[PDB]
Amino acid sequence: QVHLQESGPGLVRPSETLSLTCTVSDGSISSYYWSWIRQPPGKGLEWIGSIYYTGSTNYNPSLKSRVTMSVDTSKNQFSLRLNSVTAADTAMYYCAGLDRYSWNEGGDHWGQGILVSVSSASTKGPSVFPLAPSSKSTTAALGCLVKDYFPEPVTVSWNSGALTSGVHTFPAVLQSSGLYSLSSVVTVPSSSLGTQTYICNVNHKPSNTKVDKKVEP
Amino acid sequence: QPVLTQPPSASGTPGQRVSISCSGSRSNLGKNTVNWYQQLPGTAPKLLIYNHSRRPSGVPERFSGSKSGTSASLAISGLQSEDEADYFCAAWDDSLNGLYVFGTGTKVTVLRQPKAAPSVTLFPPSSEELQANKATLVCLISDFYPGAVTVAWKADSSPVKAGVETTTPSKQSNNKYAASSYLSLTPEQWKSHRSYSCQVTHEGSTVEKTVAPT
């Protein structure tokens, strides 16, 4: 009847410290290698790190610079603090007790997991670059790369909403730097490359930014 | 940390048997045990297999693992609609101070429709971006089912360390999936190497595109 429980603010501010504790009920603080894991929404599982009740610490090198894990032997808990949080740290965090040496029947034991999101009140304008056709002479494709903007909703039009058929706006990615980038590509007949001009209209209202890019070969 | 590689997608019709591969190095699978986790959205990973095909109580008999010299496999016989999840293999690693390494993950989908192979359009960095002391390659994937791929970038036929950001697959209008990946480079890195390649892997089909500065 072993049980792990996570606890902490499910919502947090950037450049603050992300705090999480895990209480262990029906288990010895010495019986496991107490670890923190996270999965960002969409991406895979990332082992944050592992701490032992004596103080033996082991940090993922990708996060070592800003992770500090602790253990409270009296309250039977163990904690995790993560400095310099960005939107890229919005993830589902879980405590587990990892069995380092296969010495326990029943294997590793896990908590229930909690989705911690970091809310930032800042903005950043997008950098817009054109994705040129490089003529293929047979329905070519040309686009707009919207890169490195923080607040999520941007809207992309083509020729101010005239060009509709063939518009495909791939969803934004969340880079490790905490900024978003997406691409909007259109498929146009090769004969129209030299005659018809194409301009994409990127609108990012949170930063009060509007950009129009003429995409020409 | 030498990361454990997994096929991006494993599929089957109801009742079929589906196996998941997990490839590792000498420091992780050649010396430590392998665990298999069932990952559902908005919850914690459910531990399916530990200690090479031992499973805790509550895990049906339909799951079973096995480890080899440096490879492990999970087996899900009699696939059910309730088995759609992201499955991960994790193993300890005797690297610098001891690292818990996860597998890249494998999406298990019950066949709602025939499989669709992906399309790949690769875009090199614009001259305007190069003038801004920056470089970005855009790799667009579309029209594939189920919704899971592995995008691996190469520089002169050798794999790229960092700089890759990939979106999770998303369902478009015609019930197939799309996704994009980006490789951020400095202008010197772009002009230096002979080529750069975007390699997309999906259910035993591989599509690789390449662009060059010259």
Are B23 and B82 found together in one domain? yes
The H or E element that residue B205 is part of is: strand B205-211
Give bridge partners of residue A2 from the DSSP assignment: none
Displacement of CA A78 from its chain's centroid (Å): 25
Check CB contact of B90 with chain A, cutoff 8 Å: yes
Kindly determine whether residue A173 and residue B129, on different chains, have CB atoms separated by under 8 Å: no
Q: What is the rounded distance in angstroms from the CA atom of residue B209 to the CA atom of residue A153?
A: 30
Are B8 and B108 found together in one domain? yes
Are B185 and B120 found together in one domain? yes
Displacement of CA B125 from its chain's centroid (Å): 25
- Burial bucket for residue A50 (CB in 10 Å: 0-12, 13-18, 19+): buried
Q: What is the rounded distance in angstroms from the CA atom of residue B89 to the CA atom of residue B9?
A: 14
- Burial bucket for residue B33 (CB in 10 Å: 0-12, 13-18, 19+): buried
One-letter amino acid at B99 equals L
Q: What residues contact A115, with CB distance under 8 A and at least 6 apart? A: A10, A41, A91, A92, A93, B42
One-letter amino acid at A167 equals V
Strand order in the sheet with A155-158: A155-158, A199-204, A209-214
Looking at B77, B112, B147, the residue that finishes a domain is B112
Token digits for A136? 């293929």
Interface of A with B in 147-166 (CB under 8 A): 147
Domains of chain A: residue spans and CATH: 1-120 (no CATH), 121-215 (2.60.40.10)
Check CB contact of A168 with chain B, cutoff 8 Å: yes
- The residue behind tokens 């045990």 is B33
**Backbone phi, psi, residue B90, to 5°:** -130, 145
Q: What residues contact A188, with CB distance under 8 A and at least 6 apart? A: A139, A140, A141, A142, A166, A196, A198
Which residue range(s) make up the domain with B27? 1-112
- Number of domain units in chain B: 2
**Backbone phi, psi, residue B129, to 5°:** -70, -40
Kindly determine whether residue A173 and residue B104, on different chains, have CB atoms separated by under 8 Å: no
Q: Mapping DSSP to helix (H, G, I), strand (E, B) and coil, where does residue B68 land? A: coil
- Cis peptide before B146, with omega less than 30 degrees from 0? yes
Check CB contact of B142 with chain A, cutoff 8 Å: yes
Q: What's the Cα-to-Cα distance from B48 to each of A104, A143, B56, B57, B195, rounded to whole Å? A: 15, 44, 7, 10, 42
Are B86 and B163 found together in one domain? no
The minimal CB distance from A115 to the residues B42, B96, B179 is found for B42
Q: What is the rounded distance in angstroms from the CA atom of residue B199 to the CA atom of residue B157?
A: 10
- Burial bucket for residue A137 (CB in 10 Å: 0-12, 13-18, 19+): exposed
Q: Find the closest chain B residue to A59 by CA distance.
A: B99
